[model samples]
Target chain A: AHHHHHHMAGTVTESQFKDTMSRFPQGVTIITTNCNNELFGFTASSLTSVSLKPPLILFCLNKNSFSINSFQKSDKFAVSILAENQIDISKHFAKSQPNKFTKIAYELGNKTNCPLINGATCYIECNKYASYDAGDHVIFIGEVINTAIKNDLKPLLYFHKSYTNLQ
Target chain B: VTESQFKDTMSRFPQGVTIITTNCNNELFGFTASSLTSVSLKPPLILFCLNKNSFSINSFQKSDKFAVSILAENQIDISKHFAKSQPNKFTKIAYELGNKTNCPLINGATCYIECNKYASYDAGDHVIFIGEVINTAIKNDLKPLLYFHKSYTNLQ
Candidate 1:
């Protein structure tokens, strides 16, 4: 998908922007939500902690994704920060597969009642705090209500358009 | 997770560090941020989080323009400088104005993205600031500064 930005006289081209952004490494996450007894989700690297007080975090989902409609109706969701060992899990959910839950092992607990993947580095349960409309994506802010972590596990990292591991 | 535990868990997520800078009414302000990402390319948008209670929030919201300077591996002290509560931040740092946004761009960052405010949303205790990137500069040869396990880290 090529985005024809205005480039205005001296602005960076889309390729330039994308190439630079790829250099920054980030953690991988699968944002999940249950609505009408169905599981909806997508693989995202845009997850981040927004604040500590009141415990808030945010992740962006593409407006064109197959799961946006499911997330819109959800009042709560879970952010499963993947562990280094879960590369297949990231690839499995990233595709448009029917019934993402059938292929994975997860527990439906927490106040949000969303599915939390096992072997993840951490699981954050959040209520739908707010949403903001960006150009072609929607920023969903998750108010952290409950969280758990496997501190001993290494987190899955994404960098330069590939899954990477820490040194 | 409890507060400390939550902090610890988030620290596990490897992220790039940046200094978000803005100017308003001849006053300058910035803060260290690791919670940022590109949301779209169609409109060239990016986002970063700001604490609701931060003193720089008012300046950022009021200016409607800002710059994100992705720090380099050797810039850990610069990140720590902006992460604290201090004054005259710009006075002690090296920077220049972005041609489009006029926001201060730190000199030694790996890349600088200058943007105009597109929208803002209220999160639990922070505000999500979405910006339409209008100008950018890159120094791809430099290594990025990373944050992980509550320490300034490196990439393999």
Candidate 2:
């Protein structure tokens, strides 16, 4: 028996593709970097671990992001896995603001000197390993240099286009 | 962070479970994956990472097409069954050949994406397989099966 297929002609529309992906849940994270002492960050759910032996992880950035140029030149960055109570932080960094970190409380990572959000579920500081060009986006692979975890905090999740918590 | 600590930190990041399947010649191969993510929307590209030593890696490398079945909340048993290294993981699984890729689409999955292999990149211990989407479908009534903190969960 065949199911109803949402088949597309060579290319799927953006809206259709996004709708399908929305069903797949992901943990919300804020990717931050400091270039020339200026803080730049954005909300992302594209983070994934690539390797363990060398401890590599990756997250994608849209080529059109306002901070793309800054990220391209930076060799280090930090990832903050937002806690369930940090929806405000998630929403704040998702946009392009001149002073993104002015209202947020954070400390610079010792190794990378990048902003690490306080009270997040987890923190990972990394050195850029490689970058690959994908369609409309770039995949940045990072080699982990430092990490911290809060075992008592719950992560903020995103599913069906909205924020949620683990059930 | 040490390897164990790095893994523990990553465990806090939740992910949806999926079964990436492909059919080569007359043989079928599949594996459970949680690394699936959308890459680009212009051409509807997506990707998933596979361990370089996976038993089915050769099959995937040879096959130019594959299908991703996003597991529904009720399919944890199926997910665990396919996750093992047993031969013929699809022994008792219910599925149908995808219209475009001929890959097995797990029955009762939350959604399906049929794609043609676009490219492969070398990550340290795993290979990233990018796919260009050709077909997709969704069962709006079902909830996705999620993996978090080393356990299976679902939406509330």
Candidate 3:
């Protein structure tokens, strides 16, 4: 028979928590926004659909991300779901390079006017619907206003801290 | 994105499966969620989304505490069991109550996180629950139950 037991946490090492989470796979995405005609973006695997009726999605941003302010300031943004062949796109946006959009070809979303990467499986343009603080991160909920999908393409995946095409 | 495209694009992302359970009014309630994510490290925060229409939402709303059991690779049956709307989810499932949170913790999980409700926020049709980890246990040797392409998948 199972018995009730009180257990304390935080004793688990940070390394242990991170290593344990490495096994959980996630899809790679690049969240992008434009501020003062400047393009900014970051790689994220923490994106998910929050609702369907009103078309809502959510993603997390580190409090210290350089792009966080842009996302917060901008009324609209875009989320590009990287395709299987878009590993370079993921890496490019993940780093803090000055020329984040130097060579990457993109277009302004019809509704949101945000930048959308080329050759992605899909793209979503949204209105900043809501935000909430949680620990050192902020969860941004976006209401979808416009979107496009490229048929016959698969997603880029992250698992065990490594990238892989869908199996 | 329309409902289909939004769902399709999201299906491409892989995630670990978790059964979030709570005890309210002396009854066990739980649900399956692939939306769990680690939000921060300093306070060891985690978040999971729940639909406003979920049968178990009241349990979490009524109690400011719950437990998240990260399923092991072998726990597909457990995932399917909790994904449905059965009142007796715990009757056939093997689990024990968290001594601290008094929440149900599933057996054979890769890891178990007992949490105190840190915060809640409205996200369209769902509510995002951020939990402050109070108690946790990990089984590093076990592989996690992965969800991808709208199906149960295993890491390559």
Candidate 4:
């Protein structure tokens, strides 16, 4: 749980970095993948777009999550936008449970065959571009195989404490 | 998380503005965030660390889709729109062409990205979302929208 090493080293301490990071706000995203016909996902904030010509984007995943292993054999995955009212969904995915999708309505019909969550404003299905070990977390570069958007719904956002409404 | 100390940390650095995007069931969602970090380039990866309490965290979890857009120097207004807690983000903003994922993105961005989730790990207060680059858009005239201290500004 405590990862402190060389400041930004193999195990950077969470407290200090978080304290500083908290001052800056971030966009929220969910990582989902269907590996060998199995559903799995987790809430993620460490993600970004990598390239365009090759259709690539990049995101980071912690090495300590229960859901991290499920993505190994997965060829593709999806990212979803969290709405301002969907805080519960973030909590649900992080907790220990048998079926994470019990109340979540989703379908695996995207570009990568990963299940797409309902009511989300945007989605992207991507293939693996590359991967590397960054001290503790393994970073992955994915090529954008597909993308879409639900323009009508409001996107959820992460702020200082809880979700905030921009409008 | 331990043994960490703050450096001249009060001094904020100018970062290229980024918009993380995700899609689900034919709908695209995205959030403009400043909490982005580049973790690697050999394999090509980036990080978007968001609080677990974010409202959009839920939808992003299920759809597992997203894109990141780095704003141009003058795109601070777009960053403001995404940075704020808005009900409808896509409708409020204009966008350029998107790749296969059909993820809605900001036009005039220094760069555009379409990516898939590669990994998700809990780092105490936030979830470090790692993404694999699926597609990217690079423009020449694009400048960086930098955030230093607390106000929104651009790099010269």
Candidate 5:
């Protein structure tokens, strides 16, 4: 008997899941937090707004990430929505670098004191609200306390494993 | 100051638009959502947030399965239509029932994902529904519709 399967059936495999999620375009963001007078940050595309009244936003981080300990210890963080020309910054924060913040230009958030990447389309300072355990990642929800935006800058986008600009 | 600041900051974050559909008691329910995101790949999970006061909240909470239709670039009118509170949103919309979930898979969407309800958590003023993927499809020829800076846009 011959069977034709056009789409994935049953439980989805890792490659299949990645390929499927890559089709959905998302804005790139750099999440930063300061713990014990040290800075830790990472690039993320899983960021999403969770609530409106209390103004909650959430982003997922790998459970084994080097900065997970820092994030777990910190009570506040910052979100920097990357601009179209910030591809280098996104790439820089996406990996493990001993001096990731050495050359990067940023300022301490007014409320949280976390590093806010300069030239980002927008910046959000948040106080940690809650954390949930997801399958290979942890969902960190933040209560937004302050926000700033640069209306003139365009957003940097990620689609199909590549960087793109909004058309 | 906080509310307006939060709204303005979120406006700069671009998001892919999707319509989540489910079937309950032989009736179809759906809503336009931009909060959908991929949470994990090992278990193949995804989630979307729903307001507590939404009419469809009870329907979704009762249903064990749902479908996510990632709207295509040409589905702006469909997105706008489903963004409101209507008795029957599928009146003029074209769709078909998924074999696995029996949820409406809207025609012309760029992708479709049928999921089994894995868990639901209470969020502030909203509920987060997490689903485990059971089946998936993609229309490679179609481009995705995106919401950015308060207007609908498309990929370059």
Candidate 6:
């Protein structure tokens, strides 16, 4: 039998634990934010549409990341689910670069303070709500204020260690 | 739409549940999830998001590697073992010998995946785990355990 967290003593390796998770083939999300129009975006393999009750999308961030503070300060953010051709957007945010948003064409959003990238599969604007601490990171649950999209294109996928296109 | 409707729709989409676990000393620690999924096949990766308050979170950070048991339909006992907020869960379950990490697994899960965390992000109360699948196996031949609505259910 396995012990729950409160009962386990000292530190144990994560390796021995077993997880029986179901597999999902998902599209990628590119998160964007602006602090007084100072642009920031990152490609995320983990973003998901949350709840319709509050109209939300949830994403996670490590406490030590550069975007953590920016996310905290901003009242709103944008989640851009990527399209097949948007590899540059993924590369830009996944790897930190100067003036990251400068190379990309974008326009300001209506429901939130951030901007949406051109030709994304979907755009979700968010109002920051709640957060809770995870061991190595924190979860950011947002209320989706509004949504728009160009979902016609094939989705951009992240699998293994690189980007993929649907066959 | 309400949060309930959206969640209900997602529940319909069929997700693979996961149990993230930690072994501090010889004791077993973990939680059950249907929100878990595969990230990649090439590098062999998998992920499961966890709420910040779950007991295994800190231990997950400290240990860095976790065992994944894809539940078989008959693995109801395994599901109960990893369900949230259980005190002294070890009392009710049996575990398999560890093949790689300190995480002892369930004896009859469909697959056993061992992970090395690569990156993690914050998403409100749920933290997403991006890990490298270092090892895996197809153990049991039973039907898969399906979680629907708020209980351990079966597929149609």
Give each prediction's DockQ, rounded to 2 decimals: 0.49, 0.60, 0.50, 0.05, 0.52, 0.11
TM-score for each prediction? 0.92, 0.95, 0.91, 0.52, 0.95, 0.56
**Candidate 3 chain A least-lDDT 10 residues:** A1-10
Comparing to the true complex, what docking class would candidate 6 get?
incorrect
User: How would the docking of model 1 be graded?
Assistant: acceptable
Candidate 1 residue pairs in clash (backbone atoms < 3 Å): A147-B1
> Which whole-number lDDT from 0 to 100 does residue A64 have in model 3?
85
Show model 5 residue runs off by greater than 4 Å.
Answer: A1-11
Per-residue lDDT of model 5, residues B33-133, tens digit only = 99999988778889999999999999999998889999989999989988999789998889987767788889999888898888888889899999888
Model 3 CA deviation exceeding 4 Å by range? A1-10
RMSD of each: 4.3, 2.7, 2.4, 18.1, 3.4, 8.4
lDDT (tens digit, per residue) of candidate 3 on B27-145: 88999999887787767777888999988887888787888888888999999999998688898778888866778899999787878888887777888888877767775567678
The Cα RMSD across the true interface for model 4 is 18.1
Error of 6 at B94 (Å): 15
Give the per-residue lDDT of model 1 (tens digit) for B4-97.
9778777877899999998776678999999879988888888888987788988987887888899989999999999997777899789987
Residues A91-110, model 1: lDDT tens digits: 98899866888868998756
- Name every residue pair that clashes in candidate 3: A5-B99, A6-B99, A6-B100
- Whole-model Cα lDDT per candidate? 0.83, 0.88, 0.81, 0.59, 0.88, 0.62
Measured with DockQ on alpha carbons, how good is candidate 1? 0.49
> Per-candidate TM-score, first chain only?
0.91, 0.92, 0.92, 0.84, 0.93, 0.81
Superposition error at B151 for model 5 (Å): 0.6
- lDDT at position A61, candidate 4: 73
